[PDB]
Each structure stands twice: as structure tokens, then as C-alpha cells.
């Protein structure tokens, strides 16, 4: 029966070893501290706070290294000195990301703010934030002295603006995403990054709903000592599986739980077969309309960008939930 098969499929597949998970954040740990003295050595006229390190490895466990590992460079802006701009009422029209304005130039002109060099127009650019940091990275951070102090090999990665850890020989490997971050929200602790997608917007910064998502999640859970998250892990460890569901996502599983876990019916483990089934079954609904919102911001479809194909490809993988459910394992 399927109970089984999925707890024997988390346990093969899902699960981190405890000795891996304590290593990453070590590694992840003690590379922000050398990053950060990098950037605080070469550029203290700009205000970053303290490189934090985040992600699926260190929210909650076992999830160990099968995303990126977060690092977090917050800037600290100047208090009513920037203001917000949702995407979606700017000239780009995109709901997945937000624009940062300057303002009060009259009495605070060019320069009064460190952050004014990165100034295109009146706003805020991630793309040429982006572009001093690529280049620190890569030709300006001491990689090799590093690695060799920790015991492993630290390069940066050919797109984005990921490092890549290896290994440490002792069976571990992982990405660190370098994540400049801007606070986007007073109420919550939604972010801002300085994400490229390259064409289009790149003065715009990307809306990261990661830490809201997260913390709901987890406050599901806390409360009938449920198994979203768990489910969560799981739904990424099988699409990882398939060479046609790899587009399908942390985050696009995320709002699939969100949808399901929003509501009071079963997670305990004895249901998680059936919640599982049941995540399938509105991914498939969700695939043949096309649509898959984002739970606190849904005007952005997480579908959207996807080809008649892509979509339709995924459907006939993801049959399997109610008829031949342990055949996709």
C-alpha cells in the first residue's frame, strides 16, 4: 500500500543525514563570515547589514542541501529616503517584481545616499547592483585562500550569481545564492531581491515571498503538529526525480501546500498519502487551466511562463495520482 512506499521513498530520498546537514551549515555558516568581512574591508561606504544564511537547509529539518542555500546582504536604506513601487504599476507591468524610487531629491539630492551610484534614472537598479557584485565575486573575493582555510573548493557559477560548494569531500555539495535584499514589506518579512532575469526589468528588484510562505507553514504545522512542510519536501524531492517535472519548483509546490494546507482537514502522517494524492490532483487541475497563483501574491500565475508543452508534458507524467499512485516514486 502506498503509506508505505511513500515513507520508504522519504526515507530513501527525502531525508538528510544529520552529519550532512550540520556540515552545510558549518561550511555555509563560516563563508558568510569570510564574505562578509570581504565586503565590509572593500566597500564600507556601502551600508549591507551582516550576511545572513537561510533556506529549506536551515528552516526546519531534514531538507539538508537539495536547494540553494540562501545569503542573505540586506542594504540598509535610508529611513523615507526610498519608497516602494509594485511592478505591476510600473511601465514594465510584472507582478512578480517591485521597483525601488528615490525620493525627496530636492532637499536630498544625488549623492546624499551611498546607494545614488546605483542610481538609474530615479530608482534603485538591482541590475547594476548586481553587476558590482558579480564582479567582486568573481575577480575581487580571495576563493582560493578561503577554500583552503575551510577545507573545500569555492567558485562562482556561470549564470546568476550562485557560488558552488565543493565539496566538502566528505559527501557534500551545495549552491550558495548571494541574495542582495531589500526589506519590501513593514508588516511581514517579505524581501526584495536583486535577481536578474536579465531581459526585460532588470533595474526592477524580485518579489521574495520565501520567509512568508515559510513562516505560515510552519505555523500550520506548529499548531496540530501537521505535515504540510514535510509534504512540501516531498512533492520537491519527486519532481526533482523527473526529467519533465524539474520546472516544478520549491515554489511552485509551495503555493500547491499553501492551497491544500490552508484548511482544516487531516495532516497528520497517517493522511499524508492522501494529501499527496491530493497536491497531485491540483497540480494536474491547476496545469490544464494554466494557472497556479502565488498564495500571497496572486496575481502572479507561477504557470504563466510556461509553453503549451511544457504544460501539457507535465500533465501526463503527473496522471498517476489516483490510479497508479506508487509508479511514480
Not at 510556461?306 to 489516483?322: H, K, T
Request: proline share 6%; charged share 20%.
Amino acid at each position: 500500500t502506498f503509506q508505505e512506499r511513500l515513507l520508504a521513498f522519504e526515507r530513501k530520498h527525502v531525508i538528510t543525514p544529520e552529519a550532512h546537514v550540520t556540515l552545510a551549515k558549518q561550511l555555509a555558516g563560516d563563508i558568510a563570515l569570510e564574505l562578509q568581512a570581504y565586503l565590509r574591508s572593500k566597500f564600507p561606504e556601502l551600508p549591507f547589514g551582516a550576511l545572513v544564511p537561510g533556506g529549506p537547509l536551515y528552516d526546519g529539518l531534514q531538507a539538508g542541501t537539495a536547494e540553494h542555500v540562501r545569503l542573505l546582504a540586506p542594504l540598509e536604506l535610508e529611513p523615507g529616503l526610498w519608497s516602494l513601487v509594485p511592478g505591476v504599476d510600473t511601465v514594465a507591468a510584472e507582478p512578480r517584481c517591485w521597483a525601488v524610487r528615490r525620493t525627496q531629491l530636492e532637499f536630498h539630492p544625488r549623492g546624499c545616499s551611498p546607494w545614488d551610484r546605483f542610481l538609474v534614472g530615479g530608482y534603485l537598479s538591482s541590475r547594476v547592483l548586481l553587476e558590482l557584485l558579480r564582479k567582486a565575486l568573481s575577480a575581487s573575493v580571495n576563493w582560493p585562500a578561503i577554500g583552503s582555510l575551510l577545507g573545500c573548493l569555492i567558485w562562482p557559477d556561470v549564470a546568476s550569481e550562485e557560488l558552488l560548494l565543493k565539496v566538502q569531500h566528505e559527501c557534500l555539495e551545495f549552491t550558495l545564492a548571494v541574495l542582495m535584499v531589500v526589506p519590501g514589506a513593514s508588516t511581514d518579512d517579505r524581501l526584495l531581491l536583486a535577481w536578474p532575469l536579465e531581459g526585460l526589468a532588470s533595474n526592477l528588484w524580485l518579489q521574495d515571498l520565501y520567509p512568508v510562505e515559510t513562516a505560515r507553514l510552519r505555523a500550520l504545522d506548529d499548531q496540530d503538529a501537521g505535515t504540510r512542510r514535510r509534504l512540501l519536501l516531498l512533492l520537491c524531492g519527486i519532481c526533482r526525480g523527473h526529467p519533465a517535472l524539474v520546472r516544478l519548483g520549491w515554489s511552485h509546490l509551495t503555493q500547491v501546500v499553501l492551497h491544500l494546507g490552508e484548511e482544516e482537514v487531516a495532516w497528520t502522517e497517517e493522511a499524508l498519502g492522501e494529501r499527496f494524492l491530493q497536491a497531485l490532483e491540483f497540480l494536474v487541475g491547476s496545469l490544464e487551466q494554466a494557472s497556479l497563483p502565488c498564495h500571497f501574491n496572486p496575481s502572479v500565475n507561477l504557470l504563466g511562463n510556461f509553453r503549451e508543452e511544457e504544460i501539457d508534458d507535465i500533465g501526463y507524467v503527473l496522471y498517476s495520482g489516483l490510479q497508479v499512485p506508487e509508479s511514480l516514486f
